[PDB]
Amino acid sequence: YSNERVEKIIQDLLDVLVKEEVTPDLALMCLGNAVTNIIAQVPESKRVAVVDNFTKALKQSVLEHHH
Amino acid sequence: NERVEKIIQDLLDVLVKEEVTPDLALMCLGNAVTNIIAQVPESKRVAVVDNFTKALKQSVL
């Protein structure tokens, strides 16, 4: 995927939240539900692995972005 | 609420609109989430990511 497409999609996702003036807690409740909705779109035999990779990468990125 | 439901749907509409792949979808959602967590106090980030991940792992099973 082109960095451009990926970047634009992320920004479109964040715009929805900014537009709604949500707090971080609410923003996360919504994104988490969104993610669960997507993972239910992949085969049941790949869901645990996919969620595990998603979370691992997520945590790693979160630890790395502490100033 | 389900002002949550409305928001959740607005988020998924973006992905549908871009005709995205599940993997591309997850890659974008993840980046979105990291961006949000960077908006909370550092002293709370690990706990937040852990609870967020635990939630997903429980809802997938």
From Swiss-Prot, chain A:
- Which Pfam families does the entry link to? DUF1414
Entry's InterPro entries? UPF0352, YejL_sf
Q: Which family does it belong to?
A: Belongs to the UPF0352 family.
Name the record gives this protein: UPF0352 protein CPS_2611
Swiss-Prot record, chain B:
Q: Which InterPro entries match?
A: UPF0352, YejL_sf
Pfam hit, one: DUF1414
HAMAP family annotated for this entry?
UPF0352
The UniProt family comment states:
Belongs to the UPF0352 family.
State what protein this is by name: UPF0352 protein CPS_2611
Originating organism = Colwellia psychrerythraea (strain 34H / ATCC BAA-681)
Write the lineage as a comma-separated list. Answer: Bacteria, Pseudomonadati, Pseudomonadota, Gammaproteobacteria, Alteromonadales
